[PDB]
Curated annotation (Swiss-Prot):
Range within the parent protein: 42 to 167 of 1362
Site (Acetylated histone binding): N99
Subunit comment: Interacts with p53/TP53; the interaction is direct. Interacts (via CTD region) with CDK9 and CCNT1, acting as an associated component of P-TEFb complex. Interacts with RELA (when acetylated at 'Lys-310'). Interacts (via NET domain) with NSD3, CHD4, BICRA and ATAD5. The interaction with BICRA bridges BRD4 to the GBAF complex. Interacts (via NET domain) with JMJD6 (via JmjC and N-terminal domains); the interaction is stronger in presence of ssRNA and recruits JMJD6 on distal enhancers. Interacts with NSD3. Interacts with NIPBL. (Microbial infection) Interacts with bovine papillomavirus type 1 regulatory protein E2. This interactions may serve for the tethering of viral genomes to host mitotic chromosomes allowing successful partitioning of the viral genome during cell division.
Segments forming domain Bromo: 17-123
Native species: Homo sapiens
Source species, domain of life: Eukaryota
Gene: BRD4
TM segment ranges: none
Protein name, entry field: Bromodomain-containing protein 4
Glycyl lysine isopeptide (Lys-Gly) (interchain with G-Cter in SUMO2), cross-linked positions: K58
Length: 126
């Protein structure tokens, strides 16, 4: 029921960048979402051995989670806010793909996605 390696949080041959939008994504968006009552399933990579989901990575080929995103933001791994936003969207979409409408985990993702969209609706200007 193997777990693949978690997504990279550093890559020396990829250029780094810091922007006002990226700082905001860490300080306000991620750190606020992190505290939500429904955030806990999304704070680390899915552990298929722990959670007894041997087929998780049979289905999900581009895993993403907020722990990974947090480390990426802390590393200045991203070039721009859009790249980070893409990771959040991958995380939510993975959840919808792996599960089914109405599942408790999906209700959690739906709630977080709404809050996420609420917070990125307006970003700082650079
Ligand atoms: C309702 C719920 C919420 C969390 C957990 N415990 C997790 O470790 C956990 C972390 C992340 C996920 C997850 C479980 N589900 C499970 C649960 C939903 C049906 C499959 C699937 C793989 C998913 O897509 N994600 C993101 C449990 C046991 C039940």
């Amino acid at each position: 029921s193997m777990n693949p390696p978690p997504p990279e949080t550093s890559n020396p041959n990829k250029p780094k960048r810091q922007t006002n939008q990226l700082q905001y994504l860490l300080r306000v968006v991620l750190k606020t979402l992190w505290k939500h009552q429904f955030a806990w399933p999304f704070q680390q990579p899915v552990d298929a051995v722990k959670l007894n989901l041997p087929d998780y990575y049979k289905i999900i080929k581009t895993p993403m989670d907020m722990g990974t995103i947090k480390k990426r933001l802390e590393n200045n791994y991203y070039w721009n806010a859009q790249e980070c936003i893409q990771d959040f969207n991958t995380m939510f979409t993975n959840c919808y793909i792996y599960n089914k409408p109405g599942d408790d985990i999906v209700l959690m993702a739906e709630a977080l996605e709404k809050l996420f969209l609420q917070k990125i609706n307006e970003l700082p200007t650079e």
